[PDB]
Structure formats: structure tokens, C-alpha cells
């Protein structure tokens, strides 16, 4: 149920410097958390430039629904050419008010974000993975469902799907061997071998992990109230050029 | 006893039948109405020749269809048409617009599991079926052959009495049901409805055909099909059945001519040309191109999805378009069984896949036959490289 | 607050149950003649 929308930020604003004028503008005081995280800790992902700084800001007069619960997330890094992006959820229009304040205050210019098919697959890979307290990676399997919607003459082929239960996903990943990004590593090559179909090239519309999340063209829908850090890191790395 | 006859009049809404009538052209209206007056007459005063000249003078003056329809519904037969005419209008509607109707296949089997090739003389069948059905429900049955196919078609409609009403004594109508019989095949075609009336009907056909040995109907497919032409092509007694998709040319059978045919034009001397395949997979890797090789690449896609270089039936429309198919691959890897279930939807699945192949989103050499269109109209499971129809 | 965490954990275990039923059904189906 928890949807999301992402915007890009053209300057590494220090949000804490300006919280008060937002508060009086919004007629309420918002929280502001600070986290310096090291999300891509795997060796091939890197051990430097991992120092993303995360901000949790919330407009919770209450938390009875997403609109009241609507919480913003800023995550940035100084080495990043465009330094920071933004996330928010819910239909509440106070989000628009705070965005207006940002753009008018810091002289910053902002735009919405899109995803590519490969971006979607990478994000889905990032959604399943979890880390234990011992700093050890682990994977939780969900019944994946690829869902495409091509354009063809006379609507010959309107839509088609490839559903992959948990057992088949786990079996393909194990057959490929010990790996960390099974959807890109094993599943898609298997689909191509069995059907000659290039999932990357085909017009993907959604990647649904049943009971966990729905990844879509313009938004992320999540079972949990929040997004785990690798999701946000993947988003930021996708913002760039 | 309860068998109806052609002169009875049912009851229904006039506007619905008016809208049904408006579909037909003027000439068929003229013919139908002349025949109806010839057989039944009408409330109009005058000889059929007088009726003939009135209808004539109406048509050479360029009168609109509304006038004729209103006449039919309000002066010639104002109280309502007979059951025969109601069946005839639906017959003409089906013949004119076949694609508006849906069908399902059903296979006749006997005790030992063998196919039972049903051979039918209409008279015995119709009398036996009428006698069987009349004991339970009031039934009118109309039988006819398709103008352009070797199929006998039957229309069955059931009636019952009467919301409240006094002594008018009509019988209210109900949605009709249809069955068809190819001349020599084990297969049956019928409409798609699972109300108890359709079950009673189908059971009655199964009972009445037998006459020497027991017979039972076993469905072979779960998704309907439109356009009686198409279902006849798929499952009727023909050369295309079990030669679908890339195998259509054997059904065509025009490639080979009889042996005594002339020498010098026997195609063997003259031959043909074709393209060489490539097997090391460069598809995923990646205008710098020339016409001829591209032409034969398109021909390769054509034959892989159509079975003939000339493309025996746009370049993508297939012989029988398929709207829905569901596949389920079962493969063994490291002693572990893996399931992939593909679901497609559209107006022509394989034509769309052919278009994607032309746009180079799919590798032709790795498209399996079941994905190319063979076993057409059959959803099923593939194990050990052999297609198996779903139960 | 903790109550939402309790609800989330309960939802998670319920989802695991629901997935286990489907897994059992699939593995049972894979053995049948048809």
C-alpha cells in the first residue's frame, strides 16, 4: 500500500539549515534524522564512495494513514555530480508545499525521475536482499512476476507475463551458484535460453514481488512502511549521467 | 405430443427484434418477406402479385429500411412473428456476421477409448432428438447447412410459461443454443454456455446419436473460439489439423505435383534459394546493412512463423488468429524441477511475436515450435520436448 | 511505537504461512501422473 514518488535535487542543500522557516511555513515542526550509511558494502560494489548521508523528515500531525504518515527522504553524497534526490509518499498536498519551499529557498531546481528496464531489474534484486546483525548478506525469495505490455500492429499482442514462483527462482539462483543479484545473474538468461526472449529489450511495465513490493514505471509500492537502504542507493545511482 | 409446429407465435420484446432486423440489407428483407407471405400469407389484403408490385414500387422509389421493417412489424404480421421466422433471422445473422459468435469443441468417444466418427442422416437425428427433448421441455429445433462449409448446424431453443399475467397464454423465450456437426469427424462444436438448459441439450444429443453403441462427449479445450470457419479449420476433418503453423504447406499440398507432370518444369531442375543460419549467439550482443540479406532474414522470420516463403495466410496476420494461450515449461536442472508459466493475450499472439522478431527483440533460432504456433489453439504443458495438451 | 511493529511481524508470519501452503501444493502437484 505504501507508494512512493522520487524527485531530483540540483544542489546539496543542508536541510537542517532552514528547518525553522519550513516549520513556520507548514505551521508545524518536522523531525529530521541523520544517518551516514555504507550501503554497497559488498566487495565488487565497492568500499569507498559508500558514505551516503540520509535524512528522514516527516509531516506527521498523525500517523493514521499514508498521507498523515507521509515521510520525506533525502539522500545525498558530495562526490555525486547531481548530489541529492528526494522521496515522498501519499496523496497529501503538504508535500507540494514543502517542495515549493525547497525550490524557492535554496534556489534549487527539481524534476521527477523515471526508471529503465535494467534499472527495474537491479532494483528488484536490491529489494529481496537483507543483511544480518553480523554484517552478512542474506536473501528472501518471493514469487516474481514479470509483466510486459508491448505495442503491436492491430493489437496482435497486447500483454504477456512470465510468472516465476519462489521455488523456481531459488532453483535457478542455486544452479547459477552462490550469487547476490539472481534476477540479472540467472533468471533472465534462463528465460532467454528457453524462449529466445530478451527481457531487457522487451517493453517491461512492472516487476511484482508477491506480498513484498511492486516496482513500476514511475513509483515504488511497498509492503513495509519504509524502503531498505539498497533501494535508495540504487535510485541515486540511477539518477546520474 | 408436445412437439411444436411452425404456425405458433411466441412472445418477446418488439424493440430488441427490431434492432436485430435492422442489421439486414433490403434485398434479403424482400426475399424473406416474399417467402413468408407465400407460405403463411398475412393480414394484408391482396394477391402476392399485388404484394410483389407494392414491394417493388417501394424499392425503386428508394425507400429506407425503416419503412419496410415497420410494415413487417405493424401491418403484415402485427401480433408477432412465428418461431420459424425468429430462427431464420438468427440464421441469417450468423451467416452474415460469423465473427460475432463463439464456439467450443467436444470430442465423441466410445467404450474402448477410440474416436467415434459420427455419421449422421439429419431426419433420424432430428426426430429422435425432438422426441427425447419434448418429454422434459417445449423445444423447437431448426437445422441447416452453412453456405460455404461442410457442416450441419442446429439451433435449439426452449420455452416455458409464465411478474404476473392473465389468460393471454404465451410462452416466454430464452437465450438460444447452437450445435454443429462436420460430415465425417469425431468432433462436435457447440456454443459456450453452462446453464442447465445447455447441459440438458448436450446430454440429449449424446443420448440420441448412438442408436447402436454407447457414446460420450469429452471436452478437448477450455477456452472458446470464434468464427466457425476458424474452428472448422482447426479441428474439423481437414489437412490442416495436426499440420498447423510451420507445417501448413503439407495441408496446402500445392508444392508437389503429380509424377506424370512434365519434366522440364518439375521444380527439381529449377530449384530455389534459401539463407544460411548462424549458431554462435551474437543476438544479445548487438545502419551498416544491405538489402538482400535483410530480405532473406525477413523471409526466415516469415517461414518460422508461417511455414512458407510467400507466407500463406498484412505480413503478420496468421492463418487462425489466437487470442489466448497459456504454457507451462517443466525442465530438470541439477535434479531440481523448474516451472515457468507464460501467459499471452491479444488478437494474434504469434503475429505479435513475429513483429517483435522483425524488430529484433527476440532471437528466431531460439523460438521453440510450441511458441511459434504449432499445436495451435491448445494450451498445454511441455515435458521432454513433447507438447501435452492441458487436461 | 511498538504496536505497529507487532502488526508488521504478525503480517509477516501470516504471509510465510500463506506461501508455505502454495509451496506444498506445487511440490505435491509435480509428482502426479497428469
Short mmCIF file of C-alpha atoms in Angstrom, two decimals, chain B residues 60-266:
data_model
loop_
_atom_site.label_atom_id
_atom_site.label_comp_id
_atom_site.label_asym_id
_atom_site.label_seq_id
_atom_site.Cartn_x
_atom_site.Cartn_y
_atom_site.Cartn_z
CA UNK B 60 -37.44 1.53 -56.94
CA UNK B 61 -38.58 4.73 -55.22
CA UNK B 62 -35.58 4.34 -52.88
CA UNK B 63 -37.47 3.92 -49.62
CA UNK B 64 -35.48 3.42 -46.43
CA UNK B 65 -35.22 0.16 -44.49
CA UNK B 66 -37.21 1.62 -41.58
CA UNK B 67 -40.41 1.70 -43.64
CA UNK B 68 -40.16 -1.98 -44.58
CA UNK B 69 -39.29 -3.03 -41.03
CA UNK B 70 -42.19 -1.03 -39.58
CA UNK B 71 -44.54 -2.55 -42.15
CA UNK B 72 -43.41 -6.06 -41.23
CA UNK B 73 -43.74 -5.43 -37.50
CA UNK B 74 -47.03 -3.46 -37.58
CA UNK B 75 -49.32 -4.29 -40.56
CA UNK B 76 -48.30 -7.53 -42.28
CA UNK B 77 -47.75 -9.51 -39.05
CA UNK B 78 -48.63 -7.05 -36.28
CA UNK B 79 -49.22 -9.57 -33.48
CA UNK B 80 -45.74 -11.12 -33.76
CA UNK B 81 -43.74 -13.42 -36.00
CA UNK B 82 -43.68 -17.20 -35.85
CA UNK B 83 -40.92 -19.25 -34.23
CA UNK B 84 -39.74 -20.21 -37.72
CA UNK B 85 -39.11 -16.57 -38.64
CA UNK B 86 -37.36 -15.93 -35.32
CA UNK B 87 -34.99 -18.82 -36.05
CA UNK B 88 -34.49 -17.65 -39.64
CA UNK B 89 -33.40 -14.15 -38.62
CA UNK B 90 -30.77 -15.57 -36.27
CA UNK B 91 -29.61 -17.94 -39.01
CA UNK B 92 -29.12 -15.01 -41.38
CA UNK B 93 -27.38 -13.01 -38.64
CA UNK B 94 -24.91 -15.84 -38.03
CA UNK B 95 -24.25 -16.29 -41.75
CA UNK B 96 -23.71 -12.55 -42.28
CA UNK B 97 -21.51 -11.83 -39.22
CA UNK B 98 -19.82 -15.11 -38.23
CA UNK B 99 -17.11 -13.48 -36.08
CA UNK B 100 -19.67 -12.27 -33.50
CA UNK B 101 -20.27 -15.82 -32.20
CA UNK B 102 -18.21 -18.15 -30.01
CA UNK B 103 -17.83 -21.93 -30.03
CA UNK B 104 -16.23 -24.76 -28.07
CA UNK B 105 -15.01 -28.16 -29.31
CA UNK B 106 -16.10 -31.52 -27.96
CA UNK B 107 -14.88 -35.00 -28.88
CA UNK B 108 -17.08 -38.08 -29.19
CA UNK B 109 -15.66 -41.27 -27.67
CA UNK B 110 -16.87 -44.86 -27.35
CA UNK B 111 -16.19 -47.51 -24.74
CA UNK B 112 -12.68 -48.58 -25.75
CA UNK B 113 -11.35 -45.00 -25.78
CA UNK B 114 -11.32 -44.83 -29.58
CA UNK B 115 -12.61 -41.83 -31.55
CA UNK B 116 -16.16 -42.31 -32.80
CA UNK B 117 -16.52 -40.88 -36.30
CA UNK B 118 -20.11 -39.64 -36.19
CA UNK B 119 -22.01 -40.11 -39.45
CA UNK B 120 -25.44 -38.51 -39.42
CA UNK B 121 -28.57 -38.64 -41.53
CA UNK B 122 -30.49 -35.50 -40.46
CA UNK B 123 -34.00 -37.00 -40.39
CA UNK B 124 -33.44 -39.76 -37.83
CA UNK B 125 -31.31 -37.45 -35.69
CA UNK B 126 -33.83 -34.60 -35.66
CA UNK B 127 -36.85 -36.80 -34.94
CA UNK B 128 -35.07 -38.71 -32.17
CA UNK B 129 -33.72 -35.53 -30.56
CA UNK B 130 -37.11 -33.81 -30.73
CA UNK B 131 -38.82 -36.81 -29.13
CA UNK B 132 -36.14 -37.02 -26.42
CA UNK B 133 -36.30 -33.31 -25.57
CA UNK B 134 -40.08 -32.88 -25.71
CA UNK B 135 -40.56 -35.13 -22.67
CA UNK B 136 -38.81 -32.53 -20.46
CA UNK B 137 -39.17 -29.12 -22.14
CA UNK B 138 -41.01 -27.49 -25.02
CA UNK B 139 -38.43 -27.42 -27.81
CA UNK B 140 -38.24 -26.04 -31.33
CA UNK B 141 -35.31 -27.25 -33.44
CA UNK B 142 -34.12 -25.80 -36.75
CA UNK B 143 -31.39 -27.40 -38.86
CA UNK B 144 -29.40 -26.04 -41.80
CA UNK B 145 -26.05 -26.29 -43.56
CA UNK B 146 -23.51 -23.50 -43.76
CA UNK B 147 -23.48 -21.92 -47.26
CA UNK B 148 -19.69 -22.28 -47.67
CA UNK B 149 -18.56 -25.12 -45.36
CA UNK B 150 -19.25 -28.88 -44.99
CA UNK B 151 -21.03 -28.52 -41.64
CA UNK B 152 -24.60 -29.10 -40.49
CA UNK B 153 -25.77 -26.52 -37.95
CA UNK B 154 -28.65 -26.85 -35.49
CA UNK B 155 -30.41 -24.18 -33.42
CA UNK B 156 -32.20 -25.31 -30.25
CA UNK B 157 -34.44 -23.02 -28.21
CA UNK B 158 -36.51 -23.92 -25.15
CA UNK B 159 -39.71 -22.30 -23.89
CA UNK B 160 -41.74 -22.17 -20.69
CA UNK B 161 -44.89 -20.49 -19.43
CA UNK B 162 -45.33 -17.53 -17.08
CA UNK B 163 -44.09 -10.71 -12.84
CA UNK B 164 -47.64 -11.93 -13.44
CA UNK B 165 -50.10 -12.34 -16.29
CA UNK B 166 -53.70 -13.30 -17.07
CA UNK B 167 -55.10 -15.67 -19.72
CA UNK B 168 -53.09 -14.38 -22.69
CA UNK B 169 -51.36 -17.80 -22.73
CA UNK B 170 -47.98 -17.05 -24.38
CA UNK B 171 -44.68 -18.87 -23.83
CA UNK B 172 -41.71 -16.71 -22.87
CA UNK B 173 -38.50 -17.15 -24.84
CA UNK B 174 -34.94 -17.80 -23.67
CA UNK B 175 -31.41 -17.38 -24.97
CA UNK B 176 -30.73 -19.87 -27.80
CA UNK B 177 -28.14 -22.63 -28.07
CA UNK B 178 -26.25 -23.96 -31.09
CA UNK B 179 -24.57 -27.19 -32.18
CA UNK B 180 -22.71 -28.13 -35.36
CA UNK B 181 -21.63 -31.41 -36.97
CA UNK B 182 -18.90 -31.90 -39.57
CA UNK B 183 -19.69 -34.61 -42.08
CA UNK B 184 -17.02 -37.18 -41.11
CA UNK B 185 -15.14 -36.41 -37.91
CA UNK B 186 -15.26 -37.36 -34.20
CA UNK B 187 -15.56 -33.69 -33.18
CA UNK B 188 -18.57 -31.59 -32.17
CA UNK B 189 -18.87 -27.81 -31.98
CA UNK B 190 -21.34 -26.05 -29.69
CA UNK B 191 -21.95 -22.67 -28.10
CA UNK B 192 -20.35 -21.56 -24.83
CA UNK B 193 -22.89 -21.65 -22.01
CA UNK B 194 -23.01 -23.74 -18.83
CA UNK B 195 -26.61 -23.16 -17.77
CA UNK B 196 -28.55 -26.33 -17.00
CA UNK B 197 -30.54 -25.94 -20.23
CA UNK B 198 -27.38 -26.27 -22.33
CA UNK B 199 -26.38 -29.32 -20.28
CA UNK B 200 -29.78 -30.91 -20.92
CA UNK B 201 -29.41 -30.18 -24.63
CA UNK B 202 -25.88 -31.58 -25.00
CA UNK B 203 -26.87 -34.65 -22.98
CA UNK B 204 -29.81 -35.16 -25.34
CA UNK B 205 -27.57 -35.05 -28.43
CA UNK B 206 -25.20 -37.52 -26.76
CA UNK B 207 -28.12 -39.84 -25.98
CA UNK B 208 -29.74 -39.66 -29.41
CA UNK B 209 -26.75 -40.04 -31.76
CA UNK B 210 -25.88 -43.53 -30.57
CA UNK B 211 -28.52 -45.95 -31.96
CA UNK B 212 -26.08 -48.93 -31.95
CA UNK B 213 -23.36 -48.34 -29.31
CA UNK B 214 -22.92 -46.02 -26.36
CA UNK B 215 -21.35 -42.60 -26.93
CA UNK B 216 -19.94 -39.91 -24.64
CA UNK B 217 -18.57 -36.42 -25.24
CA UNK B 218 -15.15 -35.48 -23.83
CA UNK B 219 -14.10 -31.79 -23.96
CA UNK B 220 -10.68 -31.20 -25.50
CA UNK B 221 -10.24 -27.46 -24.83
CA UNK B 222 -11.27 -24.97 -22.15
CA UNK B 223 -11.09 -21.60 -23.99
CA UNK B 224 -13.73 -20.76 -26.64
CA UNK B 225 -13.14 -19.99 -30.30
CA UNK B 226 -14.91 -17.56 -32.63
CA UNK B 227 -15.76 -17.61 -36.31
CA UNK B 228 -16.97 -21.15 -37.21
CA UNK B 229 -14.61 -21.02 -40.21
CA UNK B 230 -11.65 -20.95 -37.81
CA UNK B 231 -12.78 -23.77 -35.52
CA UNK B 232 -13.63 -25.85 -38.59
CA UNK B 233 -10.10 -25.24 -39.85
CA UNK B 234 -8.53 -26.15 -36.51
CA UNK B 235 -10.40 -29.35 -35.60
CA UNK B 236 -12.70 -30.26 -38.49
CA UNK B 237 -11.84 -33.11 -40.84
CA UNK B 238 -9.12 -31.45 -42.89
CA UNK B 239 -5.46 -31.48 -43.83
CA UNK B 240 -4.52 -28.51 -41.62
CA UNK B 241 -5.29 -30.29 -38.35
CA UNK B 242 -2.07 -31.77 -36.94
CA UNK B 243 -0.17 -29.77 -39.58
CA UNK B 244 -0.54 -26.28 -38.13
CA UNK B 245 1.88 -23.38 -38.03
CA UNK B 246 5.23 -24.11 -39.72
CA UNK B 247 3.66 -27.29 -41.16
CA UNK B 248 0.91 -25.63 -43.22
CA UNK B 249 2.37 -26.38 -46.66
CA UNK B 250 1.54 -30.08 -46.41
CA UNK B 251 -2.06 -29.03 -45.82
CA UNK B 252 -1.77 -26.80 -48.88
CA UNK B 253 -0.16 -29.68 -50.83
CA UNK B 254 0.43 -27.47 -53.90
CA UNK B 255 4.23 -27.66 -53.63
CA UNK B 256 4.25 -31.14 -55.18
CA UNK B 257 2.57 -32.02 -58.46
CA UNK B 258 1.63 -35.44 -59.71
CA UNK B 259 4.52 -37.58 -61.00
CA UNK B 260 3.48 -37.73 -64.65
CA UNK B 261 3.75 -33.91 -64.71
CA UNK B 262 6.08 -32.58 -67.38
CA UNK B 263 9.77 -32.98 -66.91
CA UNK B 264 11.31 -29.65 -67.68
CA UNK B 265 9.02 -27.67 -65.35
CA UNK B 266 9.30 -30.15 -62.48
#
